[PDB]
Design a protein around this ligand. Structure first.
Ligand SMILES: [Co+2]
Lengths: 203, 226
């Protein structure tokens, strides 16, 4: 949104860059930060940890009723069966979308997100626009922003991550996928479907 | 604190800005900001709750429109100054130096295997906040409770939109680090945690969605039996 008081994006980036390099230089001198530590953290979240992990959990739940039960009972323990878990996903609670209920997650207080299964959150999830509105006008938000129309008669449950408990949505399995392999089913599971802002891919 | 950052329910923030796709890190400075999280945590600058509080104390206008990772930088500086680990005057001098010489080198330093070990352990092992307490849970599933109207000036996880509102306990998760003490440098002081369900009508009145409910996590002191 326009703000006549705000500098250009270019000037903002230039200032931040200098401020971050300055702080970095100091933490490096303190011996608590190194170039390899920076590169390792970046590598993990750019190529190792991402939504493909959550997709694996979703497809297993879709194709294994017993695992699904365990997943809904204790998300952390269930995900550990697939070697999935860790930082910012120590406590996970998965919620199941059905014909009667639709779930959507948010961190109104900051940006809390299940890193182990979805990787780092997209910028819109961390921004004030989505965070402020989803708990108040979830139906309108889903329709206007994501083109996702949830019938008035269907309940929308919004989960606000105010604690360390991380909420993840288990989207409904799309129709016309009977007997599909886990690999094929995975192509329908998106980061958005696990946040609850969109359903899993149709067809 | 009643900070602007507590945006749940706030009107007028505008439409969601959502590109079709985006990189995990939009610039090199973001990778640095991100990596400073485990670095400052290991160095004792702050714990998770304190980290959040530092961001909550930002200039609201700056918070609302600055790139996400800038919030992280602000909290590092805040706690660096608080603990006396960062000299503000030196930081300001170095900032100007890097403004004038953006391509100047970073300080010479030795790589440390222990820092890589810490990163791998934190990422794959996590930093669990669950704790065991001697007291049993005061509440249980089905209990109708009211959220506190207390308004601490320090850190807390009491979104203004749920204060004084009545809801139903959905699940008891066991005990966890208590933000009201931890975020204010007063220790873990673990408390039982519960997810509580609030109807949209309860939260927003007539303007609320007639078929919606919000689930919010409440530490034991936050709620009382109804
Ligand atoms: Co958050």
């Amino acid at each position: 949104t326009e703000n006549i008081l705000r500098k250009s994006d270019e000037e903002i980036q230039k200032e931040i860059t200098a401020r971050v390099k300055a702080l970095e230089s100091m933490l490096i001198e303190q011996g608590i930060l190194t170039t390899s530590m920076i590169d390792r953290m970046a590598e993990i979240y750019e190529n190792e940890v991402g939504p493909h992990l959550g997709a694996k959990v979703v497809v297993k739940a879709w194709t294994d009723p017993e695992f699904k039960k365990r997943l809904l009972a204790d998300g952390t323990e269930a995900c550990k069966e697939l070697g999935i878990g860790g930082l910012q996903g120590e406590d996970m609670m998965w919620v199941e979308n059905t014909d009667e209920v639709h779930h959507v997650v948010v961190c109104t207080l900051c940006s809390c997100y299940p890193w182990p299964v979805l990787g780092l959150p997209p910028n819109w999830f961390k921004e004030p626009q989505y965070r402020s509105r989803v708990v108040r006008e979830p139906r309108q938000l889903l329709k206007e922003e994501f083109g996702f129309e949830v019938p008035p008669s269907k309940e929308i449950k919004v989960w606000d991550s105010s604690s360390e408990m991380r909420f993840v949505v288990l989207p409904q399995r799309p129709a016309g996928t009977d007997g599909w392999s886990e690999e094929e089913l995975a192509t329908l599971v998106t980061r958005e479907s696990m946040i609850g802002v969109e359903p899993a891919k149709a067809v | 604190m009643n900070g602007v950052y507590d945006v749940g329910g706030t009107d007028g923030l505008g439409p969601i800005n959502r590109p079709a796709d985006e990189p995990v890190f939009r610039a090199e400075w973001e990778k640095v900001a991100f990596a400073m999280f485990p670095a400052t945590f290991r160095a004792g600058f702050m714990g998770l709750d304190e980290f959040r509080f530092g961001i909550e104390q930002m200039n609201p206008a700056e918070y609302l429109e600055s790139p996400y990772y800038w919030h992280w930088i602000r909290t590092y500086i805040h706690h660096g100054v608080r603990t006396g680990k960062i000299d503000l005057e030196e930081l300001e001098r170095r900032t100007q130096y890097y403004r004038e010489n953006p391509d100047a080198p970073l300080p010479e330093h030795e790589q440390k295997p222990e820092l890589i070990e810490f990163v791998n352990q934190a990422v794959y092992g996590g930093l669990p906040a669950s704790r065991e307490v001697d007291r049993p849970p005061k509440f249980k599933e089905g209990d109708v409770v009211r959220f506190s109207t207390a308004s601490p000036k320090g850190h807390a996880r009491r979104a203004r939109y749920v204060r004084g509102k009545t809801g139903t306990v959905v699940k008891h998760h066991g005990a966890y680090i208590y933000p009201d003490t931890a975020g204010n440098g007063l220790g873990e002081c673990p408390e039982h945690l519960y997810t509580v369900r609030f109807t949209a009508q309860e939260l927003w009145g007539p303007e609320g969605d007639p078929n919606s409910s919000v689930y919010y996590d409440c530490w034991e002191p936050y709620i009382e039996l109804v």
